[PDB]
């Protein structure tokens, strides 16, 4: 099923649920952690220092049912900052598992 209108509405619902999590999820155990965030594509929880953070492929994607173990990744440095680059800024993110294509 192809609908721009339906996909935008699913994104808005994902965004609304994400905002609810960002506001209401309890703080981490420790004071060292990378901070939760909505990057417009995926919802990120607080990260554990020195760790990869994996979240499910966003379920608004028209092809989400094709990738239902796929993850998107970030890396939380040692440190409590999201791994970036920066050349330039924006955290490193791997979303290859959530891509539409075969091949």
């Amino acid at each position: 099923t192809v609908s721009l209108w339906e996909t935008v509405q699913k994104w808005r619902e994902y965004r609304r649920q994400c905002q609810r999590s960002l506001t209401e999820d309890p703080p981490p155990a420790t004071d060292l952690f990378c901070n939760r965030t909505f990057d417009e594509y995926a919802c990120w929880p607080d990260g554990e220092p020195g760790s990869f953070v994996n979240v499910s492929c966003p379920w608004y994607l028209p092809w989400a049912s094709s990738v239902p173990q796929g993850h998107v990744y970030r890396f939380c440095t040692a440190e409590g900052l999201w791994l970036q680059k920066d050349n330039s800024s924006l955290p490193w993110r791997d979303l290859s598992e959530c891509e539409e294509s075969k091949r």
């Binding site: 996909t7 994104w11 594509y41 028209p62």
Partner: peptide, 27 residues
Amino acid sequence: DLSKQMEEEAVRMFIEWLKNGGPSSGA
């Protein structure tokens, strides 16, 4: 259908816009 195939591209463009930072920056 040309129109449905074009709507499918529009949607892929919308997803690309999100990956590029959406309402925050976006392209």
